[PDB]
From a paper:
Cas7-11 is a Type III-E CRISPR Cas effector that confers programmable RNA cleavage and has potential applications in RNA interference. Cas7-11 encodes a single polypeptide containing four Cas7- and one Cas11-like segments that obscures the distinction between the multi-subunit Class 1 and the single-subunit Class-2 CRISPR Cas systems. The recently discovered Type III-E effector, Cas7-11 or gRAMP (for giant repeat-associated mysterious protein), is also a single subunit effector with fused Cas7-like and Cas11-like segments. Unlike Cas13 but similar to Csm/Cmr, Cas7-11 employs the Cas7-like segments to cleave crRNA-guided target RNA.
To understand the molecular basis for crRNA processing and target interference by Cas7-11, we determined a cryo-electron microscopy (cryo-EM) structure of Desulfonema ishimotonii Cas7-11 (DiCas7-11) at an overall resolution of 2.82 Å. The wild-type DiCas7-11 was incubated with its precursor crRNA (pre-crRNA) and a complementary target RNA under a reactive condition before being made frozen specimen. Under this condition, DiCas7-11 successfully processes the pre-crRNA and cleaves the target RNA. The density map resolves most of the DiCas7-11 protein, the crRNA (–15 to +19) and the partially cleaved target RNA (+19* to +2*). The core Cas7-11 assembly is half-moon shaped with four Cas7-like (C7L) domains (C7L.1–C7L.4 from N- to the C-terminus) forming a long ridge and a single Cas11-like domain (C11L) occupying the crescent center. The 34-nt crRNA lies along the C7L ridge with its repeat region spanning C7L.1-C7L.2 and the spacer region covering C7L.3-C7L.4. The first 18 nucleotides of the target RNA (+19* to +2*) remain base paired with the spacer region of the crRNA. The observed structure suggests that the pre-crRNA is processed by the first C7L domain, which yields a mature crRNA containing the last 15 nucleotides of the direct repeat (5’-tag) linked to the programmed spacer. A well-conserved histidine residue, His43, is immediately next to the leaving 5’-hydroxyl oxygen (2.3 Å) of U(–15), suggesting its role in processing. Two acidic residues, Asp429 and Asp654, were previously shown to be critical to cleavage at site 1 and site 2, respectively.
Residue numbers in the entry: 1 to 133, 142 to 238, 257 to 366, 382 to 978, 1296 to 1315, 1330 to 1601
RNA sequence: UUGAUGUCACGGAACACGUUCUUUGAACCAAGCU
RNA sequence: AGCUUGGUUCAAAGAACG
């Protein structure tokens, strides 16, 4: 009597499943339950077992069929086959106890009254509705749909992952609230099966109505569908426990966070395990990758060997399997590192019936959404915790572009067109505003990418404005999808008006011009797509012929029918009636930097082959399916520097300098850059370099103030991008500014003043600007006709005032031609170190302080050695490969050059000037290896205990930055900075003003830009036991080691030893260098800011000395090398953002103010000043003091001078050694 | 695994807000031993 | 008392969210 119809619904996109509900909570008052009534249900065994399987109720399929029937009946005027249909009853007002009621209006196709209840006959629509006049057999019964075969799964997480969906405010730009739903991918569970039992009494017209309605229902359970009718993951955890043991067995545990983040960095990197940084030699002993070897213990295997074995486990050879290994392994190491809203409907009564436009055109726009920038789509996994900001991925690990986001962006874009937001709330009858009306005829197909590589991790920090450094707890990372990912776009509009609505045409035209800001993190230039290859064709559903094959083809919704429909679509997009300009304008930036640049990324260097401590940031492009790296300045960093430039200028208001909470603020910074509640109107993109600049490595060593030698464990390097005045690094990007800001006169001035400051070199880009990195030569914003760019036109009053002459030197040194002087002496510091006064922050430009640039002219007196240690094999007479990997070859070096230009690194000049500044102001030994324990054949006390606590480095022990040392910061820690406080002076690279003059003529006469080698004597580390004669408590640290000036380099140039006079021989322990002669002129520029009157004076007095002194620079200082002179050429002071002025006339006041502080500091107890002056005293006239180190024994010195064995018991015995080493130019004879 | 004369949930952008940055001369002569 | 011979440092201190 009843026939069963086989129906299978297949989902074309991920569908949504409501979560399991208890029968108690399945009531009508459950907001979460009723919200999920349109979603698939999860059948779960009752008590405590989430094991079960999903299903779709037949009631949901029935209601979806009813809607299609109304739409089909409206399109046919109710004339199905040959008989009419009434509008239906839709009342059931007997009790109204039925979840739930129909809020939307019912479509009206006829004015006839509904069929009377209990009538002997019913129209086809009433037969479909199930109206009736165990005998209650359904006229048409819809059975539930289940997975084929009724499988069983562990729980809802086995099939789908819960996702959070938010509602973003239109004006604020930030989300009011959110709701979560299970998303079950259609690629794993595409098809459902069910039954529709039809009684034999059902009319053929009702059967035709049911079949047509089934072929019309295109969306069920939140997805586009077509209804038809007729031991495994344990490897990554065993490796994790092995690593934690190996780290534990070797102490460590501080590298786990770097190892967790670096191993996870190998997620894309099955082939990257083979290429790892390795040690400084080729020995293969890395401080991170070779932790567990422990001097060749059989039970010990290094972390490198652990991963190499994992790289070839016979199952991780697949890319996907390997990727989940690193994620699981990295996420496991991370855990060890740490350890050690549902809108509701309203029960409104009988819904009004509306005779909507029976024309009902159908429009399909097919295209590709192409990522012009990196994008970011939400979706934080509640299990994964090694990343703070994750991206939405499919279970296949493909990048997903949800229709929930695309629906929201179209809704947001439609509102901007109309200039009217939509204030309708969730619940009640549908909103009838222009935006909601267009969005109810819109269908957007959910999309995924063919590209499958893992996301990049970007590390973002919040900088403390006052301290100039990273704030406490401001390090966080995010997953970023690459540029160039193309998503297949499917837009489908259905409405009465022919073609797309007028607003929809413009928003699609906005998107076509690369102005689709689809994803989140838009402030940092993430999520700008362009709709490409758009096509469209309208379908007239009212036409019987066109509507008939529409049902037969299932609307061409499935992948089989799309290409057939795609042939009909014509290329392009309809021209909007009244096109409106998009609300965002693109400003093209062009920055030029005449210095090296580094935008740091520690994790990428932990995995890089070069092994450098710091490397520059690189992003990836989705070049098809394989990603390619590219060096770029981070958009997050560029926004941060530009935001800082604006904020430090402005005092809004009365008179904080834009450093407020911004909780309830109407701030120039808040409403240009955005707040936590007020998403900004400026969108910075990544900045990329014009050419392909290959990174270079620069070695850095922190010298000890006491021993003058390298401080242990503080030898480092980094791989910045090379730049210079010969080859500036042209950085080219964009930022997007909204209409309401670019048309605002004050914002153009606020941005223009800041961009002028950046133009004036006031804001270096990236990190390590203290040593001359990322100095901006210029900055052009040549988009944006006039407006902002008009303020980037500085005027410098170039009144030619000569810089004051250097004062004559008071220092008097008497040198005898028959004595021999020790190569170095110690300037004993004053007992008082002025630790006051809690230095000024970097958050403003304080009144009274001075900011500007000091142009200096350094000149060499003795030959100068500044080596390029990147190539210690420079001077080798061919046969290079013969001693490669020998580990004992003679080391050779060339002078530092950047892009084939002789230069002095700012780090070199910075320490050389810093050392003199520290002694002049009696500051602490900024670098001092305190932990070293002296042995006298052993001390019971540390070396740092010898000196006073005042001389101790200031860093040594939110408010920890200024509370780290109770006493505070010494004068040179204020100026040159600490780890916790950023320095106020930046030392640029010094460039050779003229063609070089070399100490030794070059081997090839053709090239005058290279010099010959000079072989130095052996250079050995300093012995503090000589300075501190014994373990006696009386003996203390003598003071700052300084190397006197002398001409022992003349003996070395001839090849003779400085002391014995015997010719030096090549050995595996002495160096060969290229040294400039005397007379080479270098210009370098010192940028400072917020300098006091005296600090700028002491700096000048430290930079330029008195007439008759000199500086010591480079290596071989004890051999008379690297005597240099600095003359301050010009002082330019930043009066304001637009006007700069000269201080060439104000120089003598700075020197006077500086010395007055010296007199106040020490009250004419300045013996260290004169002692330093004697040490700095260059030998004037014809006098040639003989300076050298004693030999071990007198018999080893052909000149007859005694040796260390004789001196050790002679005049330098035990108690005359401290006094004879702290007195400059005292001879040991 | 749902009831049935009423399901706009394609009715809802995981959105907004953060500079991998701060400091550090590639430098350096007297001990080691029974 | 016995004569002469030897390279060192290769990252560190922080920040891992308000
Ligand atoms: Zn009827
Ligand atoms: Zn609305
Ligand atoms: Zn503000
Ligand atoms: Zn200090």
């Amino acid at each position: 009597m009843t026939t069963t119809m086989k129906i299978s619904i297949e989902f074309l996109e991920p569908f949504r499943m409501t979560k399991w509900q208890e029968s108690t909570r399945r009531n009508k008052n459950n907001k979460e339950f009723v919200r999920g009534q349109a979603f698939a249900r999860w059948h779960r065994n009752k008590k405590d077992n989430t094991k079960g399987r999903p299903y779709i109720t037949g009631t949901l399929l029935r209601s979806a069929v009813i809607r299609s029937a109304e739409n089909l009946l409206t399109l046919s005027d109710g004339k199905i086959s040959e008989k009419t249909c009434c509008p239906g009853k839709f009342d059931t007002e007997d009790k109204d106890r039925l979840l739930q009621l129909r809020q939307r209006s019912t479509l009206r196709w006829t004015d006839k009254n509904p069929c009377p209840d209990n009538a002997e006959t019913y129209c086809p629509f009433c037969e479909l509705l199930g109206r009736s006049g165990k005998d209650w057999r359904f006229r048409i019964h819809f059975g539930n749909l289940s997975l084929p075969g009724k499988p069983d799964f562990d729980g809802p997480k086995a099939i789908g992952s819960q996702r959070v969906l938010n509602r973003v405010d239109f004006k604020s730009g930030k989300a009011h609230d959110f709701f979560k739903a299970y998303e079950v991918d259609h690629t794993r569970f595409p098809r459902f099966e069910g039954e529709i039992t039809i009684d034999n009494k059902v009319s053929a017209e009702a059967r035709k109505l049911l079949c047509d309605s089934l072929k019309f229902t295109d969306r069920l359970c939140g997805a586009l569908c077509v209804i038809r009718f007729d031991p495994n993951a344990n490897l990554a955890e065993k490796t994790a426990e092995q690593i934690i043991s190996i780290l534990d067995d070797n102490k460590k545990t501080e590298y786990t966070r770097l190892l967790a983040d670096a191993i996870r960095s190998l997620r894309r990197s099955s082939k990257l395990v083979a290429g790892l940084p390795k040690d400084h030699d080729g020995k293969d002993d890395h401080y991170l990758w070779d932790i567990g070897k422990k001097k060749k213990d059989e039970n010990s295997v290094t972390i490198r060997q652990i991963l190499t074995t994992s790289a070839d486990t016979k199952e991780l050879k697949n890319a996907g399997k390997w990727r989940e290994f690193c994620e699981k392994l990295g996420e496991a190491l991370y855990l060890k590192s740490k350890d050690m809203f549902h809108g509701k409907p309203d029960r409104l009564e009988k819904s009004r019936s509306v005779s909507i436009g029976s024309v009902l055109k159908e429009t399909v726009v097919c295209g590709e959404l192409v990522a012009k920038t990196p994008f970011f789509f939400g979706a934080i996994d509640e299990d994964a915790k090694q990343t703070d900001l994750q991206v939405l991925l499919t279970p296949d690990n493909k990048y997903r572009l949800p229709r929930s986001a695309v629906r929201g962006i179209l809704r947001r874009d439609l509102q901007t067109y109309f200039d009217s937001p939509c204030n309708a709330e969730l619940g009640g009858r549908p909103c009838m505003c222009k935006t909601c009306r267009i969005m109810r005829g819109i269908t957007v197909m959910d999309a995924r990418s063919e590209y499958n590589a893992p996301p990049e991790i970007r590390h973002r920090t919040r900088i403390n404005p006052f301290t100039g450094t990273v704030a406490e707890g401001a390090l966080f990372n995010m997953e970023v999808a690459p540029e160039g990912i193309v998503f297949p776009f499917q837009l489908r509009y259905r409405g009465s008006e022919d073609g797309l609505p007028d607003a929809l045409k413009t928003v699609l035209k906005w998107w076509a011009e690369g102005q689709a800001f689809m994803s989140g993190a838009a402030s940092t230039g993430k999520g700008r797509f362009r709709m490409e290859n758009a096509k469209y064709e309208t379908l007239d559903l009212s036409d019987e012929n066109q509507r008939n094959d529409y049902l037969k083809n299932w609307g061409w919704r499935d992948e089989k029918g799309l290409e057939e429909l795609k042939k009909r679509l014509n290329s392009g997009l309809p021209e909007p009636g009244n096109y409106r300009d998009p609300k965002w304008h693109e400003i093209n930036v062009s920055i030029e930097m005449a210095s090296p640049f580094i935008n740091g990324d520690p994790i990428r260097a932990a995995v890089d082959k070069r092994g450098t401590d710091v490397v520059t940031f690189v992003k990836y492009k989705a070049e098809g399916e394989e990603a390619k790296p590219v060096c770029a300045y981070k958009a997050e960093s560029f926004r941060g520097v530009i935001r800082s430039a604006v904020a430090r200028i402005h005092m809004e208001d009365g008179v904080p300098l834009t450093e407020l909470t911004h909780s309830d603020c109407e701030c120039l910074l808040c409403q240009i850059f955005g707040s936590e509640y007020e998403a900004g109107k400026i969108r910075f993109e990544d900045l990329v370099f014009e050419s392909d600049p290959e990174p270079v490595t620069f070695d850095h060593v922190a010298i000890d103030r006491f021993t003058g030698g390298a401080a242990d464990k503080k030898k480092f390097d980094d791989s910045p991008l090379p730049g210079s005045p010969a080859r500036p690094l042209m950085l080219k990007g964009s930022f997007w500014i909204r209409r309401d800001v670019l048309e605002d006169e004050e914002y153009c001035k606020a941005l223009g003043k800041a961009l002028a400051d950046v133009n004036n070199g006031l804001y270096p880009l990236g990190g390590k600007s203290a040593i001359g990195y990322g100095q901006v030569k210029s900055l052009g914003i040549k988009g944006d006709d006039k407006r902002i760019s008009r303020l980037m036109n500085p005027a410098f009053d170039e009144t030619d005032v000569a810089v004051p002459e250097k004062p004559k030197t008071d220092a008097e040194v008497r040198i005898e031609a028959e004595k021999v002087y020790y190569p170095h002496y110690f300037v004993e510091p004053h007992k008082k170190v002025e630790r006051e006064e809690k230095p000024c922050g970097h958050q403003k430009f304080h009144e009274g302080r001075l900011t500007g640039k000091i142009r200096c002219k350094l000149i060499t007196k003795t030959p100068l050695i500044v080596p390029d240690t990147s190539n210690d094999d420079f001077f080798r007479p061919a046969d290079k490969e013969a001693r490669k990997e020998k580990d004992e070859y003679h080391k050779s070096y060339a002078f530092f050059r950047l892009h084939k230009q002789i230069m002095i690194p700012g780090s070199e000049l910075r320490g050389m000037v810093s050392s003199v500044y520290e002694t002049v102001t009696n500051s602490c030994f900024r670098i001092f290896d305190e932990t070293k324990r002296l042995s006298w054949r052993v001390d019971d006390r540390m070396i740092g205990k010898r000196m006073s606590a005042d001389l101790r480095p200031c860093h040594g022990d939110e408010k920890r930055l200024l509370l780290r040392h109770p006493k505070g910061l010494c004068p040179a820690c204020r100026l040159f900075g600490t780890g916790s406080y950023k320095g106020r002076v930046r030392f640029g690279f010094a460039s050779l003003e003229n063609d070089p003059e070399w100490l030794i003529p070059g081997k090839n006469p053709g090239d005058p830009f290279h010099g010959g080698p000079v072989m130095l004597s052996l250079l050995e580390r300093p012995r503090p036991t000589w300075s501190i004669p014994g373990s006696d408590n009386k003996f203390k640290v003598p003071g700052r080691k300084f190397y006197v000036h002398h001409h022992a380099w003349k003996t070395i140039k001839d090849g003779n030893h400085p002391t014995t006079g015997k010719a030096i021989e090549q050995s595996p322990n002495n160096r060969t260098v290229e040294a400039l002669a005397g007379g080479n002129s270098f210009s370098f520029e010192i940028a400072f800011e917020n300098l006091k009157e005296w600090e700028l004076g002491l700096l000048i007095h430290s930079l330029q000395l008195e007439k008759g002194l000199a500086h010591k620079l480079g290596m071989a200082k004890s051999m008379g090398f690297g005597s240099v002179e600095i003359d301050v050429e010009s002082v330019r002071l930043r009066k304001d953002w637009k006007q700069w002025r000269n201080g060439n006339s104000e120089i003598p006041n700075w020197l006077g103010k500086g010395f007055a502080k010296l007199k106040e500091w020490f009250r004419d107890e300045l013996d260290f000043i004169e002692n330093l002056k004697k040490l700095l005293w260059f030998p004037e006239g014809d006098q040639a003091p003989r300076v050298c180190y004693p030999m071990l024994r007198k018999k080893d010195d052909p000149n007859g001078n005694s040796g260390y064995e004789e001196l050790k018991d002679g005049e330098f015995k035990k108690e005359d050694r401290q006094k004879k080493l702290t007195t400059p130019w005292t001879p040991w004879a």
